[PDB]
């Protein structure tokens, strides 16, 4: 049992990636696993004494590195969608709109290093291969933007909290300023690079399913063509204010 084989069994029960199975599904999960698994028996006993989280069962079957790969951000999530795109941009080094195995391997190498974990180059390729098996949904040999979001346990769309009422001039301004401060991580007065990316992603996702990395590139240029008044490729506060109908231009 490698992590990929385990994941594949688990995904037959956790079909909606809830990250748990039901307790009823537990016995039949063990049956799939038993097709030395004798640790299985030990395992049942372990917490047989309403759901069953993946970390619980996985703690008992996968290696310590494999548990790290599967849960290293369910513990410590991202800052926000800007940090997410920063990672995406860094590792899609050819800007393909897709993360390849050679690219994913670099992500894992850097991740292990910075977590202060030593692993051999042969380990790194097994992990690369294992991670690809788990997260490459359409089995096309590449990871899409949402796949990396799932590896990173990307949290909820920040923009969903804002409400249709709250139309007051004061409310719109409070909400503009909160939105702008969120994406302007570097505090420059403008959205640049992944700050743009993160805002595009969150905005587009208000009205359509999770977008691909190729489409993020397309929507990013469409947004710039819409509101980039001085055409410098960054979105100054005043440009976004005007395009969101803010009454007094900052």
């Amino acid at each position: 049992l490698d992590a990929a084989c385990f994941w594949q069994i688990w995904q037959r029960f956790d079909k909606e990636e809830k990250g748990y199975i039901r307790e009823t599904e537990l016995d039949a999960f063990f049956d799939h696993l038993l097709a030395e698994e004798n640790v299985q028996k030990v395992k049942e006993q372990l917490m047989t004494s309403g759901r069953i989280l993946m970390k619980e069962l996985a703690s008992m079957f996968l290696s310590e590195d494999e548990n790290f790969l599967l849960f290293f951000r369910l513990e410590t999530p991202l800052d926000n969608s800007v940090e997410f795109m920063q990672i995406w941009r860094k590792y899609d080094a050819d800007s393909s709109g897709f993360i390849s195995a050679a690219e994913l391997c670099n992500f894992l190498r850097d991740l292990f290093l910075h977590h202060k974990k030593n692993i051999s180059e042969a380990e790194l390729e097994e992990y690369t291969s294992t991670m690809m098996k788990i997260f490459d949904k359409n089995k096309d040999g590449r990871l899409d933007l949402n796949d990396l979001a799932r590896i990173l346990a990307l949290q909820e769309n920040f923009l969903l909290q804002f409400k249709m009422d709250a139309s007051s001039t004061e409310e719109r301004k409070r909400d503009f300023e909160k939105i702008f401060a969120h994406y302007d991580v570097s505090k420059t007065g403008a959205l640049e690079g992944p700050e743009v990316d993160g805002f595009v992603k969150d905005m587009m996702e208000l009205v359509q399913p999770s977008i691909s990395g190729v489409d993020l590139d397309k929507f990013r240029e469409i947004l710039l063509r819409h509101c980039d008044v001085n055409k410098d490729g960054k979105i100054q506060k005043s440009e976004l204010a005007l395009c969101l109908g803010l009454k007094i231009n900052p």
Binding site: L159, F162, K163, M164, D165, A166, S167, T169, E171, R172, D175, F176, I179, M203, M204, L206, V207, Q208, D215, K218, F219, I222, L223, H226, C243, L244, G245, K247
Partner: protein, 244 residues
């Protein structure tokens, strides 16, 4: 506001008008019901004094904007309902291009469980062979916007709009409206930001009615105010998504 609560289901309506246009006297009654939750109005009007000396379309606006549908994000701008139940006074001058003008005063309020609109209308300076006294307007009606602004001094609103009445030779008769609405009570009311009511009307007949009459159905919605910022975000997203 507490007025909103009074418009939650179907509400009966009565209308009474007494008029005099260039000396011709008439009286009109109407009854029906309003359904603000769906912006809908259903009414039937009758001339109780015989033949209507003007065309029915010239009276539509005079013959209850409290039955407009204000979307949830615009409830703070609905003056009409906020003045209920005590009601409001509605005053207008209506100028028909190249012809006469009407001047009206009405009181709109709850009388028991019924919303009642009582009106007095006076028209002067009409040409006898014009489009109005000559009955040359078509029995139909166009869609318009009604622009509403607060009038903070009088603790009401001032309203302006233009209606277009099709004439039988294919041209158009304009009617220019100036409108003031003032609360009857001294309780406080909602003074809105600038906006409009988008209005659509359809005129028809009651198949069993022998008297001179008009059946009117109306659908009205408030609009034109800015929503929460999430609204501009969603709207921009949809637009960016096109063609791509």
């Amino acid at each position: 506001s507490k007025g909103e609560e009074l418009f939650t289901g179907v509400v009966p309506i009565l209308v009474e008008l007494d008029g005099d246009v260039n000396g011709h006297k008439f009286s009109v009654s109407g009854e029906g019901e309003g359904d603000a939750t769906y912006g809908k109005l259903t009414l039937k009007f009758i001339c109780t004094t015989g033949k209507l000396p003007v065309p029915w379309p010239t009276l539509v606006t005079t013959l209850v904007q409290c039955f407009s549908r204000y979307p949830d994000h615009m409830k703070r701008h609905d003056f009409f309902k906020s003045a209920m139940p005590e009601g409001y006074v509605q005053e207008r001058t209506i100028f028909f291009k190249d012809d006469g003008n009407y001047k009206t005063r009405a009181e709109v309020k709850f009388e028991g469980d019924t919303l009642v609109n009582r009106i007095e209308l006076k028209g002067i300076d009409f040409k006898e062979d014009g489009n109005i006294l000559g009955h040359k307007l078509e029995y139909n009606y166009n869609s318009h916007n009604v622009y509403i602004m607060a009038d903070k001094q009088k603790n009401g609103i001032k309203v302006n709009f233009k209606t277009r009445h099709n004439i039988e030779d294919g041209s158009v008769q304009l009617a220019d409206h100036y409108q003031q609405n003032t609360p009857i009570g001294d309780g406080p009311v909602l003074l809105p930001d600038n906006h409009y009511l988008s209005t659509q009307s359809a005129l028809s007949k009651d198949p069993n009615e022998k008297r001179d009459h008009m059946v009117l159905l109306e659908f009205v919605t408030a609009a034109g105010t800015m929503a929460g910022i999430i609204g501009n975000l969603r709207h921009m997203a949809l637009d960016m998504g096109n063609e791509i």
